[PDB]
Design an enzyme around this catalytic site. Structure first.
Site, PDB file in Angstrom:
ATOM      1  N   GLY A  46      18.438 -41.268   7.748  1.00 15.77           N
ATOM      2  CA  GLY A  46      18.416 -42.149   6.596  1.00 15.77           C
ATOM      3  C   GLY A  46      17.305 -41.889   5.600  1.00 15.77           C
ATOM      4  CD  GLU A  47      14.181 -42.131   8.401  1.00 16.37           C
ATOM      5  OE1 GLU A  47      15.023 -41.277   8.814  1.00 16.37           O
ATOM      6  OE2 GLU A  47      13.940 -43.162   9.064  1.00 16.37           O
ATOM      7  CB  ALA A  48      14.517 -40.057   0.503  1.00 22.92           C
ATOM      8  CE  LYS A 101      12.457 -38.841   9.373  1.00 25.27           C
ATOM      9  NZ  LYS A 101      11.494 -37.979  10.090  1.00 25.27           N
ATOM     10  CB  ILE A 102      18.195 -36.524   3.194  1.00 25.16           C
ATOM     11  CG1 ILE A 102      18.543 -37.620   4.209  1.00 25.16           C
ATOM     12  CG2 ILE A 102      19.456 -36.000   2.534  1.00 25.16           C
ATOM     13  CD1 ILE A 102      19.146 -38.874   3.601  1.00 25.16           C
TER      14      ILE A 102
END
Ligand SMILES: COc1ccc(S(=O)(=O)Nc2c(C)cc(O)cc2C)cc1
Length: 193
Positions: free
Chosen positions: A102-104, A106-107
């Protein structure tokens, strides 16, 4: 011999369950029990195979910031073969292999690694890895726009073309490239794990 083999097989199954509860603890169990070699390539191959592994847990492990996890991410992306695939074909395969966290940040790391790999595998398509990244998100956004009924007004091809002006080193992408990607998504929504 047989006793060792049967015990190891059960221990492997236990490791996979442990992984699904907490990926770092799972890998630790497999490593410490000599069920998995503690190298980036072997960890990445284990995750790519994904047998009995929860894809959300796979993405959690792949999005950790520490050195080994970063290296496993890079090795994992390197396992994907994108040569002669269009960007949508390539994204379908990548996005199926694990569930994005979910974490920006990481994405962002994951999609940048994807972008780099796509471009390496298909050097003639995008001259800039920024273009590949932006267009990757453009495709993901189109998937949602076309196929999510909460989006009550669906963008036509001409609209999709217009939204991506200027990103090809200051020029535009070929109209036919954009048409091919639009049609691909229109005709088959991305599958989420
Ligand atoms: C913010 O990053 C994204 C990336 C992809 C998507 S999506 O392609 O519309 N859905 C999706 C998501 C969230 C994760 C996946 O592993 C796979 C899919 C298909 C949605 C949001």
């Amino acid at each position: 011999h047989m006793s060792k083999t049967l015990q190891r097989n059960r221990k492997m199954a236990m490791g996979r369950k442990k992984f699904n509860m907490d990926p770092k603890k799972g890998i630790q169990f497999l490593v410490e029990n000599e069920l998995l070699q503690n190298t980036p390539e072997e960890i990445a191959r284990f995750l790519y195979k994904g047998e009995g592994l929860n894809k959300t847990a796979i993405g959690d492990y792949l999005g950790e910031r520490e050195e080994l996890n970063l290296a496993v991410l890079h090795a994992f992306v390197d396992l994907h073969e994108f040569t002669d695939l269009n960007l949508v074909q390539a994204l379908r395969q990548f996005l199926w292999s694990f569930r994005l966290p979910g974490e920006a940040q990481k994405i962002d790391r994951m999609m940048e690694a994807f972008a780099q790999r796509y471009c390496l595998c298909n050097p003639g398509v995008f001259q800039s890895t920024d273009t590949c990244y932006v267009l990757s998100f453009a495709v993901i956004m189109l998937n949602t726009s076309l196929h999510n009924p909460n989006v009550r007004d669906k963008p036509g091809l001409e609209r999709f073309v217009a939204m991506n002006r200027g990103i090809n080193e200051g020029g535009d992408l070929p109209e036919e490239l954009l048409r091919n990607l639009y049609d691909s998504i229109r005709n088959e929504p991305f599958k989420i794990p």
